[PDB]
Amino acid sequence: MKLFISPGACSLAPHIALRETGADFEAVKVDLAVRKTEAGEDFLTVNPSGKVPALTLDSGETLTENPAILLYIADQNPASGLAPAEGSLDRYRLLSRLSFLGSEFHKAFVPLFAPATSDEAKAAAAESVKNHLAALDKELAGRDHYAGNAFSVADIYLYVMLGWPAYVGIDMAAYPALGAYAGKIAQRPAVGAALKAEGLA
Amino acid sequence: MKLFISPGACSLAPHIALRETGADFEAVKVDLAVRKTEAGEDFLTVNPSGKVPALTLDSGETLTENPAILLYIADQNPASGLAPAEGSLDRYRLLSRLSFLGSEFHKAFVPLFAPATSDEAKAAAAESVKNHLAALDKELAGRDHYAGNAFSVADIYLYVMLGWPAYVGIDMAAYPALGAYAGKIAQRPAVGAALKAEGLA
Ligand SMILES: *SC[C@H](NC(=O)CC[C@H](N)C(=O)O)C(=O)NCC(=O)O
Ligand SMILES: *SC[C@H](NC(=O)CC[C@H](N)C(=O)O)C(=O)NCC(=O)O
């Protein structure tokens, strides 16, 4: 099983998830600029969009999209309990959470990670990020978990993105509940293990 | 079961899905301009973000985000087969498609539907929508269905989005495979029934 990643990118979530489950896999780093793997291979052959994360199974089939990859990882080792049992109703809540993160929150940042983005555009994106953080901060105030009451891949996914604002000049001190929320997660050994492996710890 | 929608919006997907499964439900139209449902309620109470679609389940909860809602709708009637069964690898393939459609394709349109958007921003959005359309066309020229081997909620989700390009200045005659693809789905009884119900204004 190969998980294609890029240091600190959205692919960190799947990375942390695989380390939480202990499943075997090799992390293959990708140079998103040249769109080539560390080994030097052409990543476009793996995922035509050139984006990470990408998960290639032992069968040879590759899976893309964080929500799909995260749920897949969790389901291969249910003992880890990173996702509600298949068929359960809390599963849709999780899906909804993963989908909000990938389609709304994650996208609010994109303009801030773009080279030729107008000042007003950046100002607009920064404004959207903050509005999301404020809503997320209010939602998690007094709560430890984003989807339900157990630790899940949605928490891992959100944790990762919560490390992006400070990256784009936004001070998290304005969101106490998020800082507390993220702080707990940052301590799990799998988080530090994934980070160290990417060379960011 | 209640589905909150707005004529022709992204909420048309779940609407068609509920008709495909033959479920008993009610579609509550929402005036997005003032966040009020045709039932009088302040829609922000049903869904704090003020966005459709939103699905209040027969078990009491309100679900948001198309991928989650669409998957839930399909699962309620396994005899309809609108999504692969839990436990199958094919389910993740579906989740990946729903995720791409919701996080990449759908989002590429936003700037084109926004009022204050500048000409440059619109031009950039158009180019992004066109780039996805070209990839999707090439992709669907080789298969019958978008996700897997049979008609699924991913096809309904994509079909709805394929109904937007032309109205914002992107000639769909440029994508023959997509045109043929949408033309078949457009004929389904559930699709036309949803259009007939939404077209009344
Ligand atoms: S976070 C890094 C970028 N990946 C994505 O945006 C994946 C988005 C999907 N919607 C998902 O995984 O859910 C990335 O790889 N960008 C390429 C670049 O060249 O920056
Ligand atoms: S298409 C109509 C708008 N809804 C969404 O964009 C929902 C996006 C989620 N990511 C999803 O459902 O997957 C909408 O309701 N906009 C509000 C408005 O005032 O136009």
From TrEMBL, chains A, B:
Keywords: Transferase. Glutathione binds at C10, V52, N66. GO terms for molecular function: transferase activity. InterPro entries: Glutathione-S-Trfase_C-like, Glutathione-S-Trfase_C_sf, Glutathione_S-Trfase, Glutathione_S-Trfase_N, GST_C, Thioredoxin-like_sf. It holds the Pfam family GST_C. The keyword Transferase applies. PANTHER family: GLUTATHIONE S-TRANSFERASE GSTA (PTHR44051:SF8), GLUTATHIONE S-TRANSFERASE-RELATED (PTHR44051). Belongs to the GST superfamily. This is Glutathione S-transferase. It comes from Sphingomonas paucimobilis. The lineage of its organism: Bacteria, Pseudomonadati, Pseudomonadota, Alphaproteobacteria, Sphingomonadales.
